[PDB]
Design a protein around this ligand. Structure first.
Ligand SMILES: Cc1c[nH]c2ncnc(NCC3(O)CCSCC3)c12
Ligand SMILES: [Cl-]
Length: 167
């Protein structure tokens, strides 16, 4: 039993809700919140910009130190940093950005990072401003993630389409 509430159950391990991931994290304080990161951990917009804003820019300050030490992430890769006031940890995961020409096949590699964590609150990787088809992202999620994932979909119209079209 966990404290996630109001989710529709898609499979044994994948759950979904129309919710603002920022407000969800603040309520649940999950062990892991996933950020839709880029390789530079520049949290300017989309999910990343919203999560960072909710931390009063502390996420960005921490991220800049991470990059200065370690260099950029790989597309498909991740790192674990603090969850600040939102979660114990933030798993920064880089899905391919179609608006940069990145290979959509890397979306599966991106979701594989979730399997290192027993339970996660997450957005759909590569959705929104990363330009991929969210229906495809949900399919890859269900077919790749084996741990317990609670997906927050900000857009109500999109949430309804994802549910109604789910096979
Ligand atoms: C931008 C943003 C702020 N807070 C959020 N919580 C969750 N998801 C988000 N954007 C990604 C999205 O859910 C992918 C699937 S379709 C709708 C968009 C956001
Ligand atoms: Cl977005």
């Amino acid at each position: 039993v966990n404290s996630f509430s109001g989710y529709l159950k898609l499979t044994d391990n994948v759950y979904i809700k129309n919710a603002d991931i920022v407000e969800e994290a603040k309520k649940v304080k999950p062990t892991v919140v996933v950020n839709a990161a880029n390789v530079y951990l520049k949290h300017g917009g989309g999910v990343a910009g919203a999560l960072n804003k909710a931390t009063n820019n502390a996420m960005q300050v921490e991220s800049d130190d991470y990059i200065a030490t370690n260099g950029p992430l790989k597309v498909g890769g991740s790192c674990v940093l603090s969850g600040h006031n939102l979660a114990k940890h933030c798993l920064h995961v880089v899905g391919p950005n179609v608006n940069k020409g990145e290979d959509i096949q890397l979306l599966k590699s991106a979701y594989e990072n979730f399997n290192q964590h027993e339970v996660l609150l997450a957005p759909l990787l590569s959705a929104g401003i990363f330009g991929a088809d969210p229906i495809h992202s949900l399919r890859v999620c269900v077919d790749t993630v084996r741990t317990n994932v609670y997906l927050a979909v900000f857009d109500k119209n999109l949430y309804d389409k994802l549910v109604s079209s789910f096979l």
